[PDB]
Scaffold this active site. Structure first.
Site, PDB file in Angstrom:
ATOM      1  N   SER A  50      28.420  -2.993  17.789  1.00  0.00           N
ATOM      2  CA  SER A  50      28.000  -1.960  17.157  1.00  0.00           C
ATOM      3  C   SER A  50      28.749  -0.765  17.158  1.00  0.00           C
ATOM      4  O   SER A  50      29.747  -0.594  18.061  1.00  0.00           O
ATOM      5  CB  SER A  50      26.714  -1.772  17.417  1.00  0.00           C
ATOM      6  OG  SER A  50      26.568  -1.209  18.810  1.00  0.00           O
ATOM      7  N   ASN A  59      23.100   4.580  16.309  1.00  0.00           N
ATOM      8  CA  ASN A  59      23.568   3.357  16.478  1.00  0.00           C
ATOM      9  C   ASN A  59      23.350   2.397  15.355  1.00  0.00           C
ATOM     10  O   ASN A  59      22.276   2.263  15.041  1.00  0.00           O
ATOM     11  CB  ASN A  59      23.149   2.520  17.833  1.00  0.00           C
ATOM     12  CG  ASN A  59      23.930   1.196  18.183  1.00  0.00           C
ATOM     13  OD1 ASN A  59      23.287   0.288  17.657  1.00  0.00           O
ATOM     14  ND2 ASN A  59      25.031   1.063  18.556  1.00  0.00           N
ATOM     15  N   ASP A 101      10.356   5.816  19.618  1.00  0.00           N
ATOM     16  CA  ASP A 101      10.257   4.207  19.746  1.00  0.00           C
ATOM     17  C   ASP A 101       9.967   3.748  20.818  1.00  0.00           C
ATOM     18  O   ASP A 101       9.841   2.507  21.095  1.00  0.00           O
ATOM     19  CB  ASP A 101      11.865   3.808  19.122  1.00  0.00           C
ATOM     20  CG  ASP A 101      11.796   2.361  19.096  1.00  0.00           C
ATOM     21  OD1 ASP A 101      11.173   1.949  17.994  1.00  0.00           O
ATOM     22  OD2 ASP A 101      12.451   1.732  19.977  1.00  0.00           O
TER      23      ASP A 101
END
Ligand SMILES: [Cl-]
Ligand code: NA
EC number: 3.2.1.17
Length: 129
Positions: A50, A59, A101
């Site tokens: 990534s 990301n 999150d």
């Protein structure tokens, strides 16, 4: 765009990051020094393959699509390239979603490793408030 410290703070304050999910502006300015040295264009590779993009280093595996990261979710519906601009909006909309999150700002390893547990007010000390 390479930001100044107080220049970034005012831009981050104008987008309401201040105490967003409970993080004083200083936490964000501090995240942005150490993630990217204040540079909207910085891109970096992670091992897992990534890449991290922009001011906060968002990301590609979850958060934006770059077309070279297997399994990308593009949870900000966005091209990772658009996060390198000089208009930090897309990076903030997305950063609002990451932090919300569950693990908070610990989603940012330089925040954990370097900001957290510090007097994150030195990062805005001298900013016109
Ligand atoms: Cl939290
Ligand atoms: Na993605």
């Amino acid at each position: 765009k390479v930001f100044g410290r107080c220049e970034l703070a005012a831009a981050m304050k104008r987008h309401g990051l201040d105490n967003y999910r409970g993080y004083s502006l200083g936490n964000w300015v501090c995240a942005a020094k150490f993630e990217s040295n204040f540079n909207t264009q910085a891109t970096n590779r992670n091992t897992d393959g990534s890449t991290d993009y922009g001011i906060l280093q968002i990301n590609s595996r979850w958060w934006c699509n770059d077309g070279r990261t297997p399994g990308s979710r593009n949870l900000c519906n966005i091209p990772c390239s658009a996060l390198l601009s000089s208009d930090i909006t897309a990076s903030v909309n997305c950063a609002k979603k990451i932090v919300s999150d569950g693990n908070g700002m610990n989603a940012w390893v330089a925040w954990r490793n370097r900001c957290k547990g510090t007097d994150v007010q030195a990062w805005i000390r001298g900013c016109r408030l």
